[PDB]
Amino acid sequence: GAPATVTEQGEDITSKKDRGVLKIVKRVGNGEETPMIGDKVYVHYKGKLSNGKKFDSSHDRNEPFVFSLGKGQVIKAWDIGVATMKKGEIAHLLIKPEYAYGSAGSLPKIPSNATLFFEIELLDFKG
Ligand SMILES: COc1ccc(CC[C@H]2OC(=O)[C@@H]3CCCCN3C(=O)[C@@H](c3cccs3)NC(=O)C(C)(C)NC(=O)COc3cccc2c3)cc1OC
């Protein structure tokens, strides 16, 4: 399924090239531009542990998730990953714990040393 496909064909978008964040473009977005650090970004997402458990989505309550990019407002993988996305793009990310919740986890939902999977849709971004 979707996580396995990321392993096989995802691009390693980390600076250290440690496969900590792997990305596939599932739906191409519009234009050329991708958000800059400091931009306000609007997304929909679905997340889970890579094994399929602990599913959560912003579409549950059909309300976009908004954050400023590169301002420590989300896990590192999202600051890295969303920065690469075009408006209208849907991406899949597979994330090792070093780029997510690490050894601490986010208990009880997210265990220590958890690998995560996300589907993210970049709806819009603004200066
Ligand atoms: C700079 O580092 C951090 C900055 C902020 C946080 C707080 C958690 C933060 O959530 C996230 O960063 C990620 C990506 C954005 C969407 C929510 N996140 C999730 O991991 C998902 C997951 C879904 C499935 C498995 S994990 N969390 C949720 O969907 C739920 C469980 C609903 N919780 C929240 O969304 C809580 O609301 C938040 C609001 C802002 C930032 C974060 C969470 C943790 C950070 O590092 C550990």
Curated annotation (Swiss-Prot):
Description of post-translational modifications? Acetylation impairs ability to promote interaction between Akt/AKT1 and PHLPP1. Deacetylation by SIRT7 promotes interaction between Akt/AKT1 and PHLPP1, leading to suppress Akt/AKT1 activation.
Cellular compartment(s): Cytoplasm; Nucleus
Report the residue ranges that make up the PPIase FKBP-type domain in this protein.
30-118
**Tissues showing expression:** Widely expressed, enriched in testis compared to other tissues.
What upregulates this protein? Answer: By androgen.
N6-acetyllysine found at: K16
Known role: Immunophilin protein with PPIase and co-chaperone activities. Component of unligated steroid receptors heterocomplexes through interaction with heat-shock protein 90 (HSP90). Plays a role in the intracellular trafficking of heterooligomeric forms of steroid hormone receptors maintaining the complex into the cytoplasm when unliganded. Acts as a regulator of Akt/AKT1 activity by promoting the interaction between Akt/AKT1 and PHLPP1, thereby enhancing dephosphorylation and subsequent activation of Akt/AKT1.
Name by which UniProt lists this protein: Peptidyl-prolyl cis-trans isomerase FKBP5
Please give the organism.
Homo sapiens
Q: Which residues of the full protein are shown?
A: 16 to 139 of 457
